[PDB]
Amino acid sequence: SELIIHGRGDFPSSELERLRERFERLGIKVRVDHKVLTLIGISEEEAERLARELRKRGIWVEIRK
Amino acid sequence: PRGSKDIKKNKNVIQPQQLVLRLRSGEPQTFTLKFKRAEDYPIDLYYLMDLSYSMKDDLENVKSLGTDLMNEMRRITSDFRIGFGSFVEKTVMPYISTTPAKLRNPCTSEQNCTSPFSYKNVLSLTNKGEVFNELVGKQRISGNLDSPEGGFDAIMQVAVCGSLIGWRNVTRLLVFSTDAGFHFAGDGKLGGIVLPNDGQCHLENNMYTMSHYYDYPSIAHLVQKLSENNIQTIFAVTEEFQPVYKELKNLIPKSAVGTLSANSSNVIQLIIDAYNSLSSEVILENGKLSEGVTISYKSYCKNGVNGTGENGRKCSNISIGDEVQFEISITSNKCPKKDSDSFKIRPLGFTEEVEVILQYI
Amino acid sequence: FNLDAEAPAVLSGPPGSFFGFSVEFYRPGVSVLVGAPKANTSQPGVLQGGAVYLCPWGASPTQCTPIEFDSKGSRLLESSLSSSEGEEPVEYKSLQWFGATVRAHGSSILACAPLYSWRTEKEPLSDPVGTCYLSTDNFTRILEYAPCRSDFSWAAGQGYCQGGFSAEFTKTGRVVLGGPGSYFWQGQILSATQEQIAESYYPEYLINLVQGQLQTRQASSIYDDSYLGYSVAVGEFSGDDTEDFVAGVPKGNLTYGYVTILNGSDIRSLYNFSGEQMASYFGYAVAATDVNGDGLDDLLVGAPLLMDRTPDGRPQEVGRVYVYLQHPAGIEPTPTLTLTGHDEFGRFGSSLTPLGDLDQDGYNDVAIGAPFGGETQQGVVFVFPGGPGGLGSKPSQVLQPLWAASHTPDFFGSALRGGRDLDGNGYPDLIVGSFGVDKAVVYRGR
Ligand SMILES: *[C@@H]1O[C@H](CO)[C@@H](O[C@@H]2O[C@H](CO)[C@@H](O[C@@H]3O[C@H](CO[C@H]4O[C@H](CO)[C@@H](O)[C@H](O[C@H]5O[C@H](CO)[C@@H](O)[C@H](O)[C@@H]5O)[C@@H]4O)[C@@H](O)[C@H](O[C@H]4O[C@H](CO)[C@@H](O)[C@H](O)[C@@H]4O)[C@@H]3O)[C@H](O)[C@H]2NC(C)=O)[C@H](O)[C@H]1NC(C)=O
Ligand SMILES: *[C@@H]1O[C@H](CO)[C@@H](O[C@@H]2O[C@H](CO)[C@@H](O[C@@H]3O[C@H](CO)[C@@H](O)[C@H](O)[C@@H]3O)[C@H](O)[C@H]2NC(C)=O)[C@H](O)[C@H]1NC(C)=O
Ligand SMILES: *[C@@H]1O[C@H](CO)[C@@H](O[C@@H]2O[C@H](CO)[C@@H](O)[C@H](O)[C@H]2NC(C)=O)[C@H](O)[C@H]1NC(C)=O
Ligand SMILES: *[C@@H]1O[C@H](CO)[C@@H](O[C@@H]2O[C@H](CO)[C@@H](O)[C@H](O)[C@H]2NC(C)=O)[C@H](O)[C@H]1NC(C)=O
Ligand SMILES: *[C@@H]1O[C@H](CO)[C@@H](O[C@@H]2O[C@H](CO)[C@@H](O)[C@H](O)[C@H]2NC(C)=O)[C@H](O)[C@H]1NC(C)=O
Ligand SMILES: *[C@@H]1O[C@H](CO)[C@@H](O[C@@H]2O[C@H](CO)[C@@H](O)[C@H](O)[C@H]2NC(C)=O)[C@H](O)[C@H]1NC(C)=O
Ligand SMILES: *[C@@H]1O[C@H](CO)[C@@H](O)[C@H](O)[C@H]1NC(C)=O
Ligand SMILES: *[C@@H]1O[C@H](CO)[C@@H](O)[C@H](O)[C@H]1NC(C)=O
Ligand SMILES: [Ca+2]
Ligand SMILES: [Ca+2]
Ligand SMILES: [Ca+2]
Ligand SMILES: [Ca+2]
Ligand SMILES: [Mn+2]
Ligand SMILES: [Mn+2]
Ligand SMILES: [Mn+2]
Secondary structure (H helix, E strand, O other): OEEEEEOOOOOOHHHHHHHHHHHHHOOOOEEEOOOEEEEOOOOHHHHHHHHHHHHHHOOOEEEEO | OOOEEEEEEEOOOOOEEEEEEEEEEOEOEEEEEEEEOOOOOOEEEEEEEEOOHHHOOOHHHHHHHHHHHHHHHHHHOOOEEEEEEEEOOOOOHHHOOOOHHHHHOOOOOOOOOEOOOOOEEEEEEEOOHHHHHHHHOOOOOEOOOOOOEOHHHHHHHHHHOHHHHOOOOOEEEEEEEEOOOEOOOOHHHHHOOOOOOOOOOOEOOOOEOHHHOOOOOOHHHHHHHHHHHOEEEEEEEEOOOHHHHHHHHHHOOOEEEEEEOOOOHHHHHHHHHHHHOOOEEEEEEEOOOOOOEEEEEEEEOHHHOEEEHHHHHEEEEEOOOOEEEEEEEEEEOOOOOOOOEEEEEEEOOOOOOEEEEEEEO | OOOOOOOOEEEEOOOOOOOOOOEEEEOOOOEEEEEEOOOOOOOOOOOOOOEEEEEEOOOOOOOOEEOOOOOOOOOOOOOOOOOOOOOOOOEEOOOOOOOOEEEEEOOEEEEEEOOOEEEOOOOOOEEOOOEEEEEEOOOOEEEEEOOOOOOOOOOOOOOOOOOOOEEEEOOOOOEEEEEOOHHHHOEEEEEEOHHHHHHHOOOOOOOOOOOOOEEOOOOOHHHOOOOEOOOEEEEOOOOOOOOEEEEEEOOOOOOOOEEEEEOOOOOOEEEEEEOOOOOOOOOOOEEEEOOOOOOOOEEEEEEOOOEEEOOOOOEEEOOEEEEEOEOOOOEOOOOOEEEEOOOOOOOOOOOEEEEEOOOOOOOOEEEEEEOOOOOOOOEEEEEEOOOOOOOOOOOOEEEOOOOOOOOOOOOEOOEEEEEEOOOOOOOOEEEEEEOOOOEEEEEOOO
16 A cells, blocks of 8 residues: 655665655655655555565565555 | 174075174174074875765765865975775674675675775875875775764774874874764674774774774764874765764864865865964074073064063964064173184074074184 | 672683673572673584573572573574575574573563574564563573564664663563664664563464563654663652653764653653763663652663863763652752762763662662773772762762783673672672673672
């Protein structure tokens, strides 16, 4: 249902800024408290695909049902 | 009969350089000596740059800052020494992912990164800037787990490792770059490290090896060693972490905090201001004096401050563009020999010197 | 002033084993427990697994036999012991610092292993959750309690929890554990009674969820690197009889640090106590006792790295200890009294402990450690007496090691524990850890 991305612990914030820009360009709403980027209202298949891609990139992400 | 005075040869800025004195018994002869400092100060600088994974966004700024700093050192002073080092964090379990795969490349799998290292002295101090530009350009990032980085170990080793780093008896500077906070003493207990940092130099092959054996140093320890070695620290930290390092600046005397960005004017301006504020002391010496001859000194320091006796030989505050005036009186109780004599009066640690010729009637 | 410092009983363990790193009493007769983080163990394939030594009292204190809390070595991995090439331990018990925190209450014992780490089945990541064993009813049965060994794998969750870093037993037997490294080093306080652990125990599955467990919730990302739970203590601050938790946060507020008081039934923060100086470890060690004898517990907070200007203006590292007295309305935010060290790099206030009514005047006393104090930097332990106006500002007694200084620091006074009538003569006694030279001296009150 929801995808969480953690840009913390010795990680360049420019990465999180560019992911926020990329997802926002595709119309998926995005919010962030300080560096915890999350996606709201995303389908299960799309969320799983994005999570797999980001894990391949090496970012730690979590999926919430 | 009476004494006389005259100057043989004089030069404009040590204004008088050759004069002859026709002394007499019981009649002092006094002459003036004007000094103005013109030699440029010598300077040493060591640039310490973070290289944790958080530096990926800021690496270009660090490199450009290095080149601009070298250019300013060349432009401002004719004598300069420059070198640099790097650091990420202690190499123990809580601070680095210790799985065998991630020792090879703690960054992401796609990227290639060098393995972590507590501290690596890349280049000892040297007077040639071309190697500094060439070698800084080859640096590559390295990975680490926790957001704070172990820079204080690097600062400790740089402060205490005198000969290996190449520090000399000269004004010293140390530019520190980082995108994240800092560890300090007491953090090592998480990784089972409890021995406090002894402050000794444990560099082997230009690398810190006892990172896993000694805890981080406390700020008081760091302050003590920096003050002992007379190193002025300049923190070229990112705009994000300005408040924490500003609070740190109060504890450490004689330091300033700049801003790290594509535009590097702030830290350069701090360097120039630090150079301009330097000052020296002028102390006048003289060669061995013949018996039956006595000398005295007077000092006219800046702001009208004046001294006599021993204080006449010394002026404890002088900077570029400043000048001082000395009054020296020479007296003789007899005439040891008809033939004249030559004596040299020069300030300590300078090449320029005065020659005085004494004649006894 | 009556601790018999002329010839205290001395205990010694194997060399280079950090014997005496953490000490505690035991009284199911009476005996003294000593932790040995680096001592070798007989379990197979474990290098420096660590052990806890039981040194009985009354007889000649010279047995000091170890306790076989565990015997199985590094446990293997299911689906890799067979149908795969080679073995792969699922948990790495080597260098786990077992026994780094020995706490006992009645017949139960808790021995935590902060550095225990384990490779997950889903992915090969290895993280140090830490684990604690729990003996119950005089070693009748032993339960492994590892609440941070949950399904949240990486440091983003409870992966790097290092649970069991600091622990304490409440009056009702409820266990408390301080995990500093949970949630990107935000820290976490975990607790659950012995009954709940026994009910939810299931050794077959490495991942077990204890029913009724209480734990702090994850906070915003701004609070990273707080190290909450670096040091833990318990006292009655909420007015109700239920014991309330106290947790140290040495790096919570721009490294100034603070100490929190958590409700003992919900873990909702009740008070905050800000630090004084940047990077001082305000919260290195905490304690709660009734120093002024009013009947309400009073907080004490350590700060070893605090520096102050010398008489000539030179800054020096002395350390400081603060005292907050609980008025009937509620604890004040400012420190009612502060005690400062004298030795440079002394780490004064790095280990606190109540002593009970040692002087026997109706007022409780307190002992404050100083691992690197003294002329030779061997270490020193002070004893500050209580009184109606609060804790006295002049140490009543000063305790130093008898043996000559070696080539390495002794860390004398780095771990203390007192307030139990060990000798049985009706006065409290003190145990001082000296793990630098692998010794743990015991003092007795005349
Ligand atoms: C003593 O000092 C300490 C340290 O300053 C204080 O502790 C911190 O106080 C702050 C402020 O009160 C806390 O932040 C608030 O936390 C609560 C509770 O959050 C938890 O429960 C939520 C229940 O709804 C839950 O949603 C949260 O989880 C989500 O959100 C967090 C973000 O925190 C996110 O990281 C998670 O992944 C989840 O997505 C969490 O489990 C929360 O209700 C508050 O939310 C407010 O948010 C905005 C402002 O951010 C506001 O507009 C809203 O209306 C809402 O009120 C806020 O996040 C913090 O958690 C405390 N702990 C720490 C470690 O920082 C303590 O309070 C002081 N005590 C005293 C007595 O002074
Ligand atoms: C627990 O037991 C293990 C295994 O017996 C001990 O391992 C030993 O550790 C020491 C130091 O870490 C090693 O010492 C080195 O030995 C070589 C040759 O033996 C010597 O040339 C070196 O100078 C150094 O002294 C030692 O090899 C190693 N193994 C053995 C069998 O001793 C470990 O030290 C024990 N731990 C404690 C706290 O006693
Ligand atoms: C960095 O920014 C500062 C301020 O924005 C620039 O400062 C100006 O520099 C020019 C010459 O480079 C001067 O003529 C101006 O007087 C300066 N103004 C101020 C307010 O400082 C600086 O130039 C920038 N750096 C670079 C390399 O362009
Ligand atoms: C509680 O357990 C301890 C540990 O076994 C008992 O103390 C001694 O343990 C050693 C083995 O380590 C035995 O050899 C001794 O015989 C034990 N003491 C006695 C008096 O038997 C202890 O006895 C146990 N508690 C009780 C009440 O027996
Ligand atoms: C600490 O928490 C306890 C409960 O966990 C509070 O005590 C009572 O809790 C019940 C519910 O369990 C409430 O209905 C009561 O209202 C609580 N008592 C009061 C006086 O409100 C206790 O209040 C909490 N501590 C503080 C200081 O509020
Ligand atoms: C967090 O730290 C800040 C900075 O120390 C505190 O803000 C003020 O800090 C100064 C220190 O120079 C104190 O004199 C003030 O009293 C502090 N302000 C207040 C309102 O007390 C801030 O208080 C700290 N907050 C917490 C929760 O620890
Ligand atoms: C110092 O000497 C200068 C030069 O003679 C004179 O003008 C000035 O008044 C003197 N000041 C003092 C304080 O003696
Ligand atoms: C030292 O000399 C400089 C320049 O001559 C002057 O600005 C300064 O006031 C003098 N005194 C001190 C204490 O720096
Ligand atoms: Ca309560
Ligand atoms: Ca009280
Ligand atoms: Ca008393
Ligand atoms: Ca007694
Ligand atoms: Mn970093
Ligand atoms: Mn960055
Ligand atoms: Mn780090």
